[PDB]
Design a protein around this ligand. Sequence first.
Ligand SMILES: CCCC(=O)Nc1nnn(CC)n1
Ligand SMILES: [Cl-]
Ligand SMILES: [Cl-]
Ligand SMILES: [Cl-]
Ligand SMILES: [Cl-]
Ligand SMILES: [Cl-]
Ligand SMILES: [Cl-]
Ligand SMILES: [Mg+2]
Length: 345
Amino acid sequence: RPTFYRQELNKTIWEVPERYQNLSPVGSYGSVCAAFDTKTGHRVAVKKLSRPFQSIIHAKRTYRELRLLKHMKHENVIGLLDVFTPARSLEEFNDVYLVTHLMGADLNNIVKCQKLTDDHVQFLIYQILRGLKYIHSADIIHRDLKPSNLAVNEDCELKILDFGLAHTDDEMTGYVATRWYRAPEIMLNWMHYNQTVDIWSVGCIMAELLTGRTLFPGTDHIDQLKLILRLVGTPGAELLKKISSESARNYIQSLAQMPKMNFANVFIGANPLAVDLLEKMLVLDSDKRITAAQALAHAYFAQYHDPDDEPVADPYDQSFESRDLLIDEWKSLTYDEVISFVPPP
Ligand SMILES: CCCC(=O)Nc1nnn(CC)n1
Ligand SMILES: [Cl-]
Ligand SMILES: [Cl-]
Ligand SMILES: [Cl-]
Ligand SMILES: [Cl-]
Ligand SMILES: [Cl-]
Ligand SMILES: [Cl-]
Ligand SMILES: [Mg+2]
């Protein structure tokens, strides 16, 4: 066990191992400090979880987040550098700290402040799909892909972060970026969703890098649905059968029918191979969207695709999600995962 030291920063007590130095508050879910990790030489983000065990729902969310971060080992996905508690026993266990690489710019800063060549768009979208092939191979769904959740450095290298741990109703209301990248079947709860919702988000992101503009900036759920159906067309009877709510099906049939638009006249001047890929991502029926593994072999990525360097993930057991436990049982499972952590090479 390392030696810990205590300090009060911005009305918060931080008790951390000696290896972490020069702590400086950055953000505030949890509270975050930047620090220098003397063991590895990296600048890191240290997150102290807020009330991780106050309720059954919060205790299970803490466990879910720690299990997810411990599993992710891929160049294009955020991973876990360390996790610790100052507790010496389960009986005194109360606080959890997570340590990751400190991130700087996100894709928003690049998308709004940079002139992207088509070569930049190829490389950035390739890396998102390479990380998604890995995530999806473990039967994990990200659920919240958007420019603010994508870290990018000066060399145009990209990491996916901030997995959806199950956002609220006020958060998705009105003219807000938290909803502009969501697939229509999850935005309006049309059906049980799956990993195909992430490919819809990649299409919205790719379109925005090509044009510099948000693809579907709706002022509310219904305005956003109208923008989507104007581009991709209103649904046929085949997809209508797959929507469970009769009211939702009735609402769809209240709208005048519209054909899918010509994407070369929407994305004027774009690489014809980029136009072709967008048509294969932005498909209303989620059964028919291209998958991440299939998209990596598309000719748009010919310069970067390497089928011997696009790895899949170890199996991930999520049976805990259907389990009913008490607060102290979720807390004990979390404690076991903290003490069993083994750092990366
Ligand atoms: C913080 C540690 C995250 C991690 O393990 N990243 C990583 N990148 N590629 N691999 C295996 C090839 N593993
Ligand atoms: Cl230490
Ligand atoms: Cl990482
Ligand atoms: Cl503690
Ligand atoms: Cl965003
Ligand atoms: Cl009509
Ligand atoms: Cl597992
Ligand atoms: Mg985020």
